[PDB]
Amino acid sequence: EEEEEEALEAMQSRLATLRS
Amino acid sequence: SDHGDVSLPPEDRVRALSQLGSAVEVNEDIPPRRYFRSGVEIIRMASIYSEEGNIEHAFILYNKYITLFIEKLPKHRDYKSAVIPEKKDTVKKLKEIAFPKAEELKAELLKRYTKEYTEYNEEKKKEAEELARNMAIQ
């Protein structure tokens, strides 16, 4: 659960890159 | 539309699509779990759009899926409260499917659009040069 939230949070920068 | 205009730089056309994907709104009166359950069908539909050659709609829809599970849904009033058995498989799907597919579609869209942009600009240049020559003649 912590590890899932943490995985989602780690993908924020990747979403930023996707939107670039 | 920005994304449809061949005269527009390929990067702006692609950004218009990912912007449309980002626009997805979370209804606070829908339980977060329903969003997780819907993920399976969203993925299926995005795959179908891609296979149809509708890469713009596939790209938009993967962006929506990603925007939802990454950005918007964690901000849902009931999110932190919710017990979501599907969350683990959703993380796995984001990594396995949604991100790499959307990234691959982004590259494909950039490549197609660049071809269109190049060819268009070449045609328009020749036409503009012709007009410039004729305005000199007169």
Query: Pick from B15, B19, B70: which is nearest to A12 by CB?
Result: B70
A5 contacts chain B (CB < 8 A) = yes
Residues present in chain A in total: 20
Enter the resolution in angstroms. Answer: 1.8
- R_g (Cα) of chain B, nearest Å: 21
Query: Is residue B10 within 8 Å of B117, Cβ to Cβ?
Result: yes
Q: Take residue B66 and report the two structure tokens written for it.
A: 């990603």
Do residues B63 and B20 touch, judged by C-beta distance below 8 A? Answer: yes
Per the entry, the structure determination technique was X-ray
8-state DSSP, B8: S
Q: Is A8 on the interface with B (CB under 8 A)?
A: yes
Query: Which single residue is written with the structure tokens 């890469």?
Result: B55
CB of A4 within 8 Å of a chain B CB? The answer is yes
| DSSP code of residue B97 | I
In chain A, which residues have their Cβ closer than 8 Å to the Cβ of B66?
A: 11, 15, 18
Taking a C-beta distance cutoff of 8 angstroms, is the pair B65, B46 a contact?
A: yes
Q: Under 8 Å CB-to-CB from B46, ≥6 apart: which residues?
A: B58, B61, B62, B65, B98, B101
Domains in chain B with CATH codes: 1-138 (1.20.58.80)
Three-state DSSP class for B59? helix
| Among B89, B120, B127, B132, CA closest to B6 | B120
